Amino acid sequence: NNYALSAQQLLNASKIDDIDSMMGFERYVPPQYNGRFDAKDIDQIPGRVGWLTNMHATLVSQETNQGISGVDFYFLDEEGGSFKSTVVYDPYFFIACNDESRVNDVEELVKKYLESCLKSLQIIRKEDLTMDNHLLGLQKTLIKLSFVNSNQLFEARKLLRPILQDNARNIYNVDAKHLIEDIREYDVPYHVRVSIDKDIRVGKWYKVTQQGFIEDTRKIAFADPVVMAFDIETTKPPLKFRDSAVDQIMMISYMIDGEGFLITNREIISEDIEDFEYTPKPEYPGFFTIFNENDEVALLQRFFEHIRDVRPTVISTFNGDFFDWPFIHNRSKIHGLDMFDEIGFAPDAEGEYKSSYCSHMDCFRWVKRDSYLPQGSQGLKAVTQSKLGYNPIELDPELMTPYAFEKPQHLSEYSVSDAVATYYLYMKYVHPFIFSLCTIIPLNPDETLRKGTGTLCEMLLMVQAYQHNILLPNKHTDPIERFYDGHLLESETYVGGHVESLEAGVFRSDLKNEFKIDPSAIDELLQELPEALKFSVEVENKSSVDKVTNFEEIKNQITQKLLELKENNIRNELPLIYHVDVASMYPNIMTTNRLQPDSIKAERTCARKLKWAWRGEFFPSKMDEYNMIKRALQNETFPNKKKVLTFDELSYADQVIHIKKRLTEYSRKVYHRVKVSEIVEREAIVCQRENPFYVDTVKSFRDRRYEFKGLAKTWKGNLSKHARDEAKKMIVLYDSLQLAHKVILNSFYGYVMRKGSRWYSMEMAGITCLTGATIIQMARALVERVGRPLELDTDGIWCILPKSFPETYFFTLENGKKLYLSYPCSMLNYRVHQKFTNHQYQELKDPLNYIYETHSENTIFFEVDGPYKAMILPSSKEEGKGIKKRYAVFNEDGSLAELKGFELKRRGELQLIKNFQSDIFKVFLEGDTLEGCYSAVASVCNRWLDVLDSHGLMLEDEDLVSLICENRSMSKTLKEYEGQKSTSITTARRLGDFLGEDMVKDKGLQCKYIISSKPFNAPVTERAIPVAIFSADIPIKRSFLRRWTLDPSLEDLDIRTIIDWGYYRERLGSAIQKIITIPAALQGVSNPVPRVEHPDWLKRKIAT
DNA sequence: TAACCGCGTTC
């Protein structure tokens, strides 16, 4: 019932109100005032001020029978206390009409059909970007159906779903039902709807008054919530995962606002623990006090009791939604405790643990979304070293439970290791970012942390659409089929970024390089030189040439250098290793071109036609064959007392899955292919006068990210003097903050392609990509002619320029100030603004009379990364091909500048290749000549080959397994890969066989394997031996080690007997080839490690 | 062979 649901949500509400009272969040109703809610005199109006930390939807009773929708807001005050306060706002959505004439007619019919759920209805008007002449002022008439609570709203939709689907009777010559076109803004989440309409945001200060919340724009900083972070280490069966059903919590470490506490279960932890200290850097103090308890239930209850004592409004964990919280929850139930009644936490619809007064900050969600760290470096170990600057305590999870008996202090100091890292990781990186993000995104801390960047973008866009009175579009629904010249398509897409491998090998400042400069390109550069340094001064640095002392001097110094290189073109010199890269490329291409989904028109100036490249992946079959297989499927029966289902009876989508997978069979059996793919160049018109609310939202977020990037460089430019340890401290703060916004910023591009988007446009996303490829290839077309481009990717070109090429000069202003000039950079930027500027950008100057001014927009700019020391790019093993998206770059202080894509960086490759790649790359700095350098690298390669050919003799059996184990992660559970083979798959099966099916039950299983030599002549996937078998009982070992070798006579069990050493040697050989010997070949040096042979295509090209 | 896939990168 609708009155039953409201009754259920009402006692949830009274429970929450009691938990909030317990934790200090009593509902405050402000003193009554009947005056002007004048905002300047804020300190006269009676009420209570507070920093807003949370907001949850609610249902509120009479203070009729059903409740009223509202939102509880959770504040911290100025007096060290807390309070909570409720706002009510009627849920609402809109009905649109085919004909504006009879709008009241459909308004009386809706008053009839929704009589038992509607509360009120208005006639309002919003701007529809779909509508004709909306730019001249026209608006859309809509009925605003208002409701008492969120249940009546969904109830009205359930009644209107008939009427809408119904319109999809004397035939010899309209009713009110058939004028309901669609319904709008029914989707909007309620607390989002309140936070938007009432302009309330978590993280701002408000004075709560009877007239509403008053933003107090005076307070400088946030308040200071009491923050608590906790980790739990529990018992574990050997070589098995931790199971809440069987195991029990050994200890719970935690920190509350800099003070640490460890609670221990003295029924598994042998002795008792003294209050010790763990501070791995001076800035991260950690004095812990231990609460030694007896049983678990005593441990679980010093925990629950300590939470109520401190009443924290933030609790942080690391992966606490998947492991820590559900473990504590289930072990309290077995001990007869309701965690909700004790703490207020309970799982939500996604199984994540949330409370009302207290945000649950799982940092694992931050590192995964916003850290800009590779997944290989997203464990808490790596996250501490990267972003906190020390090496935390580390302990083998197999030694964990026995060290509880044998060495309790060590396990105690690994437990507080994880807690100190978690608390300070939250306070330095997660807390400032999320709560600042909350001041602009209409969500509370829990959802700001966990929602996807696409969805964060939708929020920001929905505030904008609303505040400019723009009617929200409904969410996009995927076309269930599309057809291309009769062929059913699998994927409709566009050509994305351009990326080129051009040269491989070692390039280095100390070693000369041959260049062949195009004289005709120089001629161009000096022709455009005069206007290009005017550009560097006025548009790059935002000044005037009229104020610069030495414009002609710099203009002459470049001229002779360019002229010298024009006559003496074929030159052999040291190179300048540089990187050019467009700053926020795709956003700036959108803002420069006024690119937004509502701007894309279809034949119906103000018109900037731009091209994109459409790619379809259709089946080779004809359409006669498509209906043939559909008829085949219709005659056959499908499963679900009704487990018998017509083909027609199933949803149009699921049908497609069956048609598509049957069509892959017929195509893979009549046409020898599953997909034919085709590029089609298409053009679209982009209206330059359309409401730029989307473009302006991306412009505003771009500007927000740019400021953090500029502050980062400002401290980098201030790095000359603990100055070298405090200036470099923030380089990371600000870079993190700029990198955190990078993914959200670029999601404004991806958003227009996302499922369920409200502003879907493939045309828009394709136009951005094609423009970006045209720009990057224009830049390479010129760098070819004056240097050697090494590697190019979307918006970036690595290159060597002749040492003779003009680089850096400083303009001087009458002020005495200097302006930075990189002629390699400004020579491209000037070309970009010549060739890619939008001279059709129209913007309303006077809205009151609809008068637009037209002007020229170009925010596209390259940026120069740096004069570098060395760069090592690998080469493919196949002829002619290169390897894209991998390389290493070094700074002139020897330090590593960039490492991209190599197995060293990726999550769980074969460790041997990871340690090899960690070793050689720095060795590429040694030697005095190109060949002397390759000889230094070779010496490292032979040392590794020595390890492999010696069958790791001189290597301990503990490191030998660490070095030869590959670690692949199963994105699902083993059941879902049915009909697939992989080393990750079979090693997971063989592990379920060995240790039980209970370790095959959770997704994301880490599969650590060895490839065995036996069974010989078998595919590599059938020889993947899980690594824990060698840690097992000698009986259990020798059983499975032969069931997997298919050698029942097997007796020797030393790892060196089982391992297919020829297999790992071929892998090491491949890494030696691609990084070293084959690029060596391409730079004219004979193979530097003869023990790894060149391929026969390279052997043929030594004699030819 | 040529085609395609899963994972985790670089954009």
Added chain:
DNA sequence: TCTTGAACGCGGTTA
């Protein structure tokens, strides 16, 4: 239900 995109390397599969 909630859900940013495409390009690419590598080691495995398949017919």
